[PDB]
Write a protein that binds this ligand. Structure first.
Ligand code: DCP
Ligand code: CA
Ligand code: CA
Length: 325
DNA sequence: CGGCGGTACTG
DNA sequence: CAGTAC
DNA sequence: GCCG
């Protein structure tokens, strides 16, 4: 469906360069531009046509036409030499751009330098230890196996527990970066307490190997960690689990499915219509002072299904595969 | 030009 | 609070 | 980077 693949391919490189350098807004504009380019019903044939597309302005149109007519993008040949290294360091889970810059500034140029000389948080050490595993997208069959491991451990405490793999898996992609499992109960009550029990059950199976984010003191809806399927040669994989009350399930699912750019656009649109959208609920506009500052949430508008959220936002419903932005 | 999603942990 | 993540 |  992407009729501008040669253009978007080269735009994404520049976008990634801006991203690993910490120019997050520039990268955002690029992301919206590239998404708009991939959804266009036709290969772009002129500057004027490109400019008429939302998300694309003069500066982006210049590059689009440059790639269209020459087949190349000169700016790519002028990208800083630090960028491949900053990208290398950014590929470590737990390490972002500030950290990458700092490491580069300290002279580090390889994962080996990071291993032997760099100061690493617990999360960064886990990310470094499983660098290759976490960087490799898994086949969705493996994601299925992981999801059903979690589901099997969950429904053992309560067979009525609903478990849905979200993220790229739910959007139907052939490969997944990590497994995203949402859990709830139509009951409305028996979703409570299952967090500790599920985590313990998965730990005793030897399924969970590392924890990145899990605040267990709190009787907590989110877990970020690492798992590995039983059997020889199995890779470590990133696993994220959310447990939500049924009344929020639709917004949770929607959030979890994404994609992230889809979520940002949808929340922006909600904001323009005097509403607020989060993983918890679709609500009315947040409460503000004389100053523009927010001081309180808006009133929750009940949403049993994703379609209800689309409805209350005045949007045509889209299946998960149509949210793959 | 200023704003750019809404949220949550870790240390 | 800065950084990072979903 | 784009948009209003
Ligand atoms: N900045 C972000 C990152 C993620 N998400 C949400 C939407 C995503 O779909 C979901 C899962 O995040 P992932 O990092 O797992 O991204 P995907 O599953 O969509 O793709 P991938 O296969 O690369 O993991 O969380 C979001 O709202 N905002
Ligand atoms: Ca994922
Ligand atoms: Ca994830």
């Amino acid at each position: 469906t992407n009729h501008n693949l040669h253009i978007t391919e080269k735009l994404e490189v520049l976008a990634k360069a801006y991203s690993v350098q910490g120019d997050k807004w520039r990268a955002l504009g690029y992301a919206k531009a590239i998404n708009a380019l991939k959804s266009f019903h036709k290969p772009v044939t002129s500057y004027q046509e490109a400019c008429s597309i939302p998300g694309i302005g003069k500066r982006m149109a210049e590059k689009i036409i440059e790639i269209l007519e020459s087949g190349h993008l000169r700016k790519l040949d002028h990208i800083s030499e630090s960028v491949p290294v900053l990208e290398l360091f950014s590929n470590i889970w737990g390490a972002g751009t500030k950290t990458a810059q700092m490491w580069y500034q300290q002279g580090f140029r390889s994962l080996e330098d990071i291993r032997s000389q760099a100061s690493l948080t617990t999360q960064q050490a886990i990310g470094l230890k499983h660098y290759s595993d976490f960087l490799e997208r898994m086949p969705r069959e493996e994601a299925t196996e992981i999801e059903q491991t979690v589901q099997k451990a969950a429904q053992a405490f309560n067979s009525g527990l609903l478990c849905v793999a979200c993220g790229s898996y739910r959007r139907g992609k052939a490969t997944c970066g990590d497994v995203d499992v949402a859990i709830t109960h139509p009951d409305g009550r028996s979703h409570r307490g299952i967090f500790s029990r599920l985590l313990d059950s998965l730990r005793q199976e030897g399924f969970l190997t590392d924890d990145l984010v899990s605040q267990e003191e709190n009787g907590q809806q989110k877990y970020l960690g690492v798992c590995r399927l039983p059997g020889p040669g199995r890779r470590h994989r990133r696993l994220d689990i959310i447990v939500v009350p049924y009344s929020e399930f639709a917004c949770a699912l929607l959030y979890f499915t994404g994609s992230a750019h889809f979520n940002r656009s949808m929340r922006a649109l909600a904001k323009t219509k005097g509403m607020s959208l989060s993983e918890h609920a679709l609500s009315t506009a947040v409460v503000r002072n004389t100053h523009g500052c927010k001081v309180g949430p808006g009133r929750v508008l009940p949403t049993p299904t994703e379609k209800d959220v689309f409805r209350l936002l005045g949007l045509p419903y889209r299946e998960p595969a149509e949210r793959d932005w």
